[PDB]
Amino acid sequence: MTEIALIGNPNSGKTSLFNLITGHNQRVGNWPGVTVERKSGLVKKNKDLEIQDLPGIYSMSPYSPEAKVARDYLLSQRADSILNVVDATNLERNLYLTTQLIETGIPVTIALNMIDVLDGQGKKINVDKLSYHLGVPVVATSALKQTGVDQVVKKAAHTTTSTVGDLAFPIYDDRLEAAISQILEVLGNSVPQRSARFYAIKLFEQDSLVEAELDLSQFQRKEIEDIIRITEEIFTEDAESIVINERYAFIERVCQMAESHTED
């Protein structure tokens, strides 16, 4: 059946949503790191959908074994849809992960959760603008007030690897895009086609996990090493910082659009 993965920072309301969606009473708690293993369940309002609760994760270069369970689930290619649960009150921080999720090529739908806390803070987010600039569907949800939950599941079900055509990725500085294209050429079929961009950017960043997982030839490694060196000279910066700063810069732009109330 259709597999929907709940992915997002710890303490963002993933399990709270899962409980509402499935009828389960899985562990929910007011600190990061409550869920520690995968839990499956059927969506109650549509039994053709299976949803997976997973440990929280801050980055796809993860900081804990628990987060690595979420990462490895996604890179195993089992999910048809990512339901990215985003804490609306800490948007910028949460979108760091989001950018990497979009790059996997598994279609992303955002549950913009804890919208009730944002409402209580006297703040708002332009959901249509956020969606437009991020290139993914966005539904405002509250697991507390039980709003938007059935809507975001329906959207996630409709936003699948089988229904979505050409996927729209976050576009960075064209000097980085050039290096990404070069790395993709070198990789060829050495990575799954759907997630190739994710892996190419991780190779540029010289991510240890990804370098260990991919069985790249000496030839490929030498050409990638050369592409990174050339690009660092162009940027006048190290590779790791180039990518971090480009993600940050992208998120900054999108968030100033999400804060924008003025009609356009």
Ligand X SMILES: CNc1ccccc1C(=O)O[C@H]1[C@@H](O)[C@H](n2cnc3c(=O)[nH]c(N)nc32)O[C@@H]1COP(=O)(O)OP(=O)(O)NP(=O)(O)O
- For the annotated binding site, the residues are 8-16, 19, 22-23, 29, 33-37, 53-56, 113-116, 126, 128, 143-144
Question: Minimum Å distance from CB 29 to ligand X?
Answer: 5
Three-state SS at 110: strand
CB of 31 to ligand X, least distance (A): 7
Q: Which does 142 bind (CB under 5 to 8 A by kind): Cl ion, ligand X, Mg ion, none?
A: ligand X
Q: In the structure encoding, which two tokens stand for residue 37, read together? A: 């293993």
Angle at 196 between CA 68 and CA 256, to 5 degrees: 75
Nearer to Cl ion, 32 or 135 (CB): 32
- By CB under 6 A, the residues from 133 to 152 that bind ligand X are 142-144
Complete edge-to-edge strand list for the sheet that includes strand 39-42? 39-42, 49-53, 2-7, 81-87, 108-113, 138-140
The DSSP result for 161-226, as a single string, is TTT--SPPPPP--HHHHHHHHHHHHHHGGGS-STTHHHHHHHHHTT-HHHHHHS---HHHHHHHHH
Contact segment (CB under 5 A) with Cl ion among 8-16, 30-38, 54-62, 151-159 equals 54-62
Instruction: List the binding residues for Mg(2+).
Output: 15, 19, 22-23, 35, 53, 126, 128
Closest residue to Cl ion, Cβ-based?
67
Give the footprint of ligand X on this chain (CB under 6 A): 8, 10-16, 28-30, 32-35, 55-56, 113-114, 116-117, 142-144
